Amino acid sequence: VNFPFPKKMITESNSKDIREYLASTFPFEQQSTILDQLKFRQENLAELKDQIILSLGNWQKLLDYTNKLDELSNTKISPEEFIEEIQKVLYKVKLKLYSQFNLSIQDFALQIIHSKYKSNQISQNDLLKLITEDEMLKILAKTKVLTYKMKYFDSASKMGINKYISTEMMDLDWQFSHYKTFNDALKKNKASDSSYLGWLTHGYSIKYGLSPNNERSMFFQDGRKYAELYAFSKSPHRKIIPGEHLKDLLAKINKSKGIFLDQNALLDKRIYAFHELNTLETHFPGITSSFTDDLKSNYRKKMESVSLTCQVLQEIGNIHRFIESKTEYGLFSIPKIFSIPIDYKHGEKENLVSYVDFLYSTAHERILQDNSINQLCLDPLQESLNRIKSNIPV
Amino acid sequence: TLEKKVRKGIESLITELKLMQAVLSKVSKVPADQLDEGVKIWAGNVKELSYQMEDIVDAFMVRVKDLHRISAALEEVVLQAKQLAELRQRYEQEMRDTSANTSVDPRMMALYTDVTELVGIEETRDKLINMLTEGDDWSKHPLKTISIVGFGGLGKTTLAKAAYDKIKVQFDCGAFVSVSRNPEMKKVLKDILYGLDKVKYENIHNAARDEKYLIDDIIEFLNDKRYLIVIDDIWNEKAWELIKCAFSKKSPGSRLITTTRNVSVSEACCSSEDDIYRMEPLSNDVSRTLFCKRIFSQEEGCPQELLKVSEEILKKCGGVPLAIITIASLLANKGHIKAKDEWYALLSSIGHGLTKNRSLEQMKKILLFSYYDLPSYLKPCLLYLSIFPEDREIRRARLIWRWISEGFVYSEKQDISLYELGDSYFNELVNRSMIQPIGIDDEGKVKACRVHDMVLDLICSLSSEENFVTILDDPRRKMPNSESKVRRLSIQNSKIDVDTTRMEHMRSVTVFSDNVVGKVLDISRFKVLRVLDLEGCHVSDVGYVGNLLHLRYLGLKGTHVKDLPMEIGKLQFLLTLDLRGTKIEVLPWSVVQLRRLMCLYVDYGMKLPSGIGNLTFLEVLDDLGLSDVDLDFVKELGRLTKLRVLRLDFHGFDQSMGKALEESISNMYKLDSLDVFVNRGLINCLSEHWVPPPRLCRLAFPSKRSWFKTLPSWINPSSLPLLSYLDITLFEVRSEDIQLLGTLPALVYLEIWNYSVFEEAHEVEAPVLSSGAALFPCATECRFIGIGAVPSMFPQGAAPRLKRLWFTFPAKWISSENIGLGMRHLPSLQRVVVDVIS
Amino acid sequence: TLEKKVRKGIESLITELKLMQAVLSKVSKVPADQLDEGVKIWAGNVKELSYQ
Ligand SMILES: Nc1ncnc2c1ncn2[C@@H]1O[C@H](COP(=O)(O)OP(=O)(O)OP(=O)(O)O)[C@@H](O)[C@H]1O
């Protein structure tokens, strides 16, 4: 079906028309809108050992640490000892089905700290004194991508949104709702470490296949890169007259910038070049400030236009993951008692299909159009618009 | 027994070599115009036989079945030597009446050219005038020289004469005298005398007194006068020092000018760099005007369709005011005799076949002058540049390793580690004004090199008439008429004719940015192979090297190599092993089996097996990954004391193991550079009580997240006074650390990071250079991070040479009086944008 | 085998040629008055061999 543009308008006395339902419904509680409860995971903490006991026969350490995590989940311990208690397994484990339970061991344990932090049980300074540690940075930068790929990638690939997975656009997921603190508080206190951890995170994302390629990544998986990255982060006059091991980086930046500005060449490699490039400026502002070339190519607006496309597709995929469930929510994400049955809900007809029109009108309201942008924005948006209007009634 | 006969023939063979390179060195000195063709043909056959015997001797040396093969080969080679012996005798004559006149100087007619013909010579003649005539006022300043170095024909005599024609009426004497490649000193001095007075010295070329009395005469004639002599085309400065003694008296108000093609002889003059006058290629606009002055009558836009051809061709010459003259005179016999098609043919011709033309060889002599003046053991080095493509920068390290692996570097002094010898070769090539250097690598030396285009094709042809190299180019698309006698092959863009049938004795092979490798070409068929170069390819199949035994150089930079065979231990002879940019992440255990190496450009991601200490001869190691290492392996690194450069990064041994290696460093004494990389930590490696190696020049530190507590004590002007590079980062800072560092002799490069300023809440203080006056004789590059370096550390007489300075400046000091700038310092200290902090 | 020896003699013969035309080109430059007759006879004979 060639569905046309749903021309609508989100104005005053209309944002609250749907957001009021969205402010209390099961989804969107841990998310936001571009137009702008502890029992839920406690039950998962209870079910943490559903299938571990089935095949304990090698497979004993899983249950051995499972009951320890269950104990530490509900027991009240002072912050200056709770970190030591929980790190006893964090600093112990090293590494098919095993890793599956191993990730749940790490993922559920770390969520406890945020749960106690939002309750003001753990002092902010105490958390600050530990987050700066180097090892847990690479622990989180690994567990986040592993947890995302193990559950959501299987359903994302079928929808065709796998090619539009954005590492930087990951905190908005409802399940990974605890990362706003780790991002914003760390940025406010230690700004450099935020860019450092994002740089580390994208390196594994490249290596684990989030943005796969057959050619090496000359910007990640090497400490000497961050040396210059942090060297220019403190001096405003180092790009004008660069030094050695800095001309090469600029050459590889502008070569990929020209690849992105091209039209005829292959699209998947352009998507690949998008991810690291977008990661570069957000963490390191003023790094590709080609004041001349960007103006005669509308590059500054083009990057934002192609960035908003992935943001729209994320929420579209969320709606698709919500419609069929009414497990695409992902393993160990929603417990069985809190699950969602098959019956159609009356509030969907007034807050979902109408809200899709608002989303597409918001998508098609301020994005520029170009022959390069059309292959990057217009075509995926039209494909998603066609796919979203062929499954709502059914 | 049987081996005894072979080994007793080998020394006879090597003596034969020695004589044959003697003869070939003798013949190649003379230009190939006075050389009779019979001797030329004989010499070519001599060279081919030389290759054959070198092959036999290398094969025998590598091996010790084979004895019989070696025997047959050596006997038959003796047979061709014997046969070729009397061919020269059989057909040869004398011709007592063959006295053809000596050739005249090809660049004398150029001296006689119209004044109102040269364009753009201005604003350089005036600058050279006033860079020496500024002292002509108060004409009592002591005499000085101003040399002019340059390459090819960028125009030295022209500008020298131009300056020689304007300011003369204010002088009493003067002489413009030339010198050839092999001058006659008495002839030169007679030339000088005739240039002063032609009346008393009209027949001064007749009398043959001696080298000395005429020197006394010229010394006597030069009293109480200002002479302003100019002498041009001086090569091999040993000649020049004779003339300088002729000017040995105090003479206020006189100066002299020199020109040469070697910068390595001008520093022997004028005792100072401010008197050295470099000359540059002309600008694009001036070059365009000059180019259109010749071919076009008065206007340029009438073609309007070959314009892009004009810029494209003029780019090939670059700025040379001789190449463009040649092309303009060749390209139009009478008013655009040709248009837009043969122009493309000409453009395609350059690089492979443009030189062979008419009225064009009259200028190639001027270029081959420099090549002929080269001593031996350097002609192969210059001719080796034809392998690489037309416009591509060449890293000098690759060149040096290729030369050493080939076998063009050798000596019998035993005081040279054989790498700095190749470096000396490279520097000699550079200072002869024959290669352009660019950039500075992580070695503290020049990064890469580039070759002029019309010299590149010229040397390509010169190496092409013999079998020194072979090129497969689309514009060329030519192959020698003998597939057998191919030694060096330099594959390029062409990917069609990749035949490999009849090169059994393939010395070396290289591929440049081509996917044709592998799918069409086979290397394993090469029974012998000296060096292998495959950087930039996209093939991971290199596991057939076990069939190769003579390999020396193995370049695999950016090759997508996943793994390399376990059978590499068979390569006892090897000099280089580069693996940077490869997918392989672990090395096979069969590397301790190896015995000889000097460099190992390994990736720190890859794993180094135990027993590394056995590679005693190893001389440079790069990017070693030090993680999860046991103590004995670390201590092995102190055993092999031959390093000059070492690069280290690590993440997983921050223990007392750092101190264990810390003294193990001091076991080596040949270091030149060092650097250590570690992330965001206090440096738990270096103690304050550890003697450093006596020789250190660079001593870098790449990491900026890590820090030292304070300035190390073992850094002192006493130990290691050879530093020209600092690159430090540390937590605190002291106004006395700068005072300590201002005592070291050279410290050309300075870069200091104050960790606490940009990490912790701290105010950038103002350190004070308390003691001394200058503390910085030659520190051109100084970098201060988080440290306030106001211009008023001292008056201008503190750092004579400082082109660049970086520091931080608070906004609260704007109203203060500690920023009292406004004066011009001694170096070019006028381009600065300080990082200001609110 | 047998053809190998012949073909390995051919290039030697070619070199012999090249030397002979070198010599003949050298001698023919001078006018035939300053040339001594022994050299002339030798030149004629080598020319005939060159044809063969
Ligand atoms: N401004 C100019 N306009 C035209 N031709 C020029 C100009 N400057 C130089 N040339 C040309 O450059 C050549 C001069 O060569 P140059 O002065 O370098 O000679 P040199 O010192 O004897 O030796 P070499 O050429 O080996 O350096 C001549 O061909 C001359 O015509």
TrEMBL record, chain A:
<protein>
    <recommendedName>
        <fullName>Avirulence factor</fullName>
    </recommendedName>
</protein>
<keyword id="KW-0732">Signal</keyword>
From TrEMBL, chain C:
<comment type="similarity">
    <text>Belongs to the disease resistance NB-LRR family.</text>
</comment>
<protein>
    <submittedName>
        <fullName>CNL9</fullName>
    </submittedName>
</protein>
